Write a protein that binds this ligand. Structure first.
Ligand SMILES: O=P(O)(O)OC[C@H]1O[C@H](OP(=O)(O)OP(=O)(O)O)[C@H](O)[C@@H]1O
Ligand SMILES: O=P(O)(O)OC[C@H]1O[C@H](OP(=O)(O)OP(=O)(O)O)[C@H](O)[C@@H]1O
Ligand SMILES: Cc1cccc(N)c1C(=O)O
Ligand SMILES: Cc1cccc(N)c1C(=O)O
Ligand SMILES: Cc1cccc(N)c1C(=O)O
Ligand SMILES: Cc1cccc(N)c1C(=O)O
Ligand SMILES: [Mg+2]
Ligand SMILES: [Mg+2]
Ligand SMILES: [Mg+2]
Ligand SMILES: [Mg+2]
Lengths: 346, 346
């Protein structure tokens, strides 16, 4: 017999939950049965206890069970996502969003999950919108986007309406919680590959564990400077997930000849400014922003390769080649134009 | 400057707050400006971080600033409280309420703060009602009761109307938090002495520190069997507060000739059953219930003596003797009758 007092008491006592308890809590939240005070108490208590992979897997699994899915047979087996938790506090240009366009332009199907800014000036969805991409499309039109353009974007509020009670609590309290992990774990098209950024060093392993229990090829990444992206300012920690297991490693882009950047060189601004940065990179401008875009695009291409599995180093070399070429041949610039066109034609 | 994200982020990072932050959170809560999700996040985060005496002092001082006071010059300089957090999850007779009647009958002014049951079947207030005592009196009438009877009772909801937002959240989440500490620390008559029970072993020291900052003469007690009272079933831990300093002691009633009782000998029931138990003890019945009442009454008398202090052991001997005589002379049974008579005169 589950209840709020039982579950919250267990968490405040600093104990992992029994199997099924996280799922019961999440289902109460998803069906509008939880009071705002109960939602907040659960999110905070779970965060301070330190969630396990099994618990987060129950939360995400329940949340997925309530999502709008894409129509049957519309997502290719080898589709990839590129998305992070956000909340890194650094306010960069939209690296994941740029990388995703480059990846699609390299010939890899991309189905991106994303959302507006939470505490940054412009999130991926905001920048896309400022670019003229339609972010508001439902299941059928996202699947058309994917078939006709090679990329689709699932706007979280549109695909996860039942999450609205949790989302409101998240805003009211502001502090990052276990809920901040859920976006990347709940892409409603359920792609089997991903480059997944985590701002919280402690929780990246937990996210990796969740991907390990799915049929997934994923790189969960944390820049050692705190970015929820593969960084160019220093090393990054990567949890490589495949075949139900995890291989944690230290990754250094200087091994591929990247010069060290400074965080300020990756600094962003508002939607219009971050949109300008996208157009600059895709038009071929050289420098630290392109470098970081290419690095993350290659990471996603490496995750995609893990599905029909090349070894680690050769996969990276090929991913960096394909990502650079997608920019230099105009393919990425052309694909964005094509994506904007698609949205304008209804 | 202060906000929820700042204050909740500090606690989730397991850091003590900066001075004034708990005070800010409490004024948001008491003004009706905190959302229930914010109240709950704060209560939980504070609990799992582990509150300091300074933080709890800010919460209680802000709360008291919003409470109705007693009229000026109506609380004796040497009034005492007898009250605990409750929440020990044991079903006992109303030990604090019985001890308070005996203490008042021994000639020590008692101004009791209290409230109905939260998890037990009958709380102090409910049992008092069943005995015919009027528990819902305003400041002027509590003051008159204290002057004419020697005891008065401040019904928390009547004295702390602005706490209703927090009390609703407490109920909704069910789990004990730092807020469970506030009752004993926010007696609106501000008696300077007390016997204060704490159901949560780790938090008793924090309660003791808040009393120490006030220069109160208090014994904060926790039975080693988990009671928020001085127990007769085993030893107790007492944090003695005197001269603005706290020291921990183990207390063994066997040293005063008390036999070891069993927990079920102290079992209570509904309001009516607990009212009969009060009447039995005041009528001079021997047994484990009288023993426990006498022990706790002695503890309050010791605390009272510490206002104008005297050696520990003879203070206790005199306390036990004063409590026993108050019963055996008929004075305790007579005081309850006077108290009931006072309420009927209104
Ligand atoms: O405001 P923050 O909480 O810091 O979040 C910034 C962005 O990071 C995530 O998306 P994504 O990785 O898709 O966006 P990106 O293109 O900026 O990397 C999130 O959905 C936000 O849009
Ligand atoms: O329902 P619970 O959370 O377990 O709390 C039981 C009682 O303990 C506190 O009062 P007090 O110490 O004044 O009453 P007592 O006479 O019952 O000891 C509280 O105000 C309740 O009346
Ligand atoms: C911000 C958000 C993210 C994911 C799902 C939602 N329903 C929402 C919402 O605001 O309703
Ligand atoms: C809804 C979503 C999807 C993918 C990543 C996210 N950070 C989010 C989010 O934090 O709102
Ligand atoms: C339970 C309680 C304790 C102290 C003050 C209150 N208003 C309340 C209330 O229920 O409103
Ligand atoms: C309001 C109050 C006063 C004194 C002790 C308590 N436990 C309480 C309570 O928890 O309601
Ligand atoms: Mg990102
Ligand atoms: Mg980022
Ligand atoms: Mg008590
Ligand atoms: Mg008790």
């Amino acid at each position: 017999v589950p209840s709020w007092p039982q579950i919250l008491g267990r968490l405040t006592d600093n104990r992992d939950l029994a199997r099924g308890q996280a799922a019961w809590a999440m289902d109460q939240i998803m069906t509008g049965n939880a009071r705002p005070a109960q939602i907040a108490a659960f999110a905070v208590a779970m965060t301070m206890k330190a969630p396990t992979a099994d618990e987060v897997g129950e939360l995400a699994g329940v949340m997925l069970s309530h999502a709008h899915p894409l129509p049957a047979d519309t997502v290719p087996d080898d589709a990839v996502d590129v998305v992070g938790t956000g909340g890194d506090g650094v306010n960069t240009v939209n690296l994941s969003t740029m990388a995703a366009i480059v990846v699609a332009a390299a010939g890899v199907p991309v189905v991106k999950h994303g959302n507006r800014a939470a505490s940054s000036l412009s999130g991926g969805a905001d920048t896309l919108e400022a670019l003229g991409v339609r972010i508001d499309l439902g299941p059928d039109l996202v699947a058309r986007s994917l078939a006709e353009v090679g990329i689709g974007f699932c706007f979280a509020p549109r695909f996860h309406p039942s999450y609205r009670h949790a989302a409101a609590v998240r805003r009211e309290i502001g502090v990052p919680t276990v809920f901040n992990l859920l976006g990347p774990l709940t892409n409603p098209a359920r792609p089997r590959a991903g480059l997944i950024g985590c701002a919280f060093a402690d929780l990246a392993e937990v996210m990796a564990g969740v991907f390990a229990a799915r049929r997934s090829s994923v790189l969960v990444v944390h820049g050692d400077d705190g970015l929820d992206e593969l960084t160019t300012t220093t090393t990054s920690t990567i949890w490589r997930v495949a075949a139900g297991s995890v291989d944690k490693l230290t990754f250094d882009p200087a091994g591929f000849g990247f010069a060290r950047a400074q965080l300020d060189q990756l600094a962003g601004g508002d939607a219009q400014a971050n949109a300008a940065a996208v157009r600059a990179v895709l038009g071929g401008a050289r420098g630290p922003v392109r470098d970081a875009v290419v690095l993350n695009a290659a990471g996603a291409i490496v995750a995609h390769a893990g599905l029909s599995s090349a070894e680690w180093l050769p996969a990276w070399e090929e991913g960096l080649r394909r990502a650079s070429a997608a920019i230099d041949t105009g393919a990425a610039e052309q694909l964005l134009a094509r994506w904007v066109r698609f949205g304008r034609q209804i």
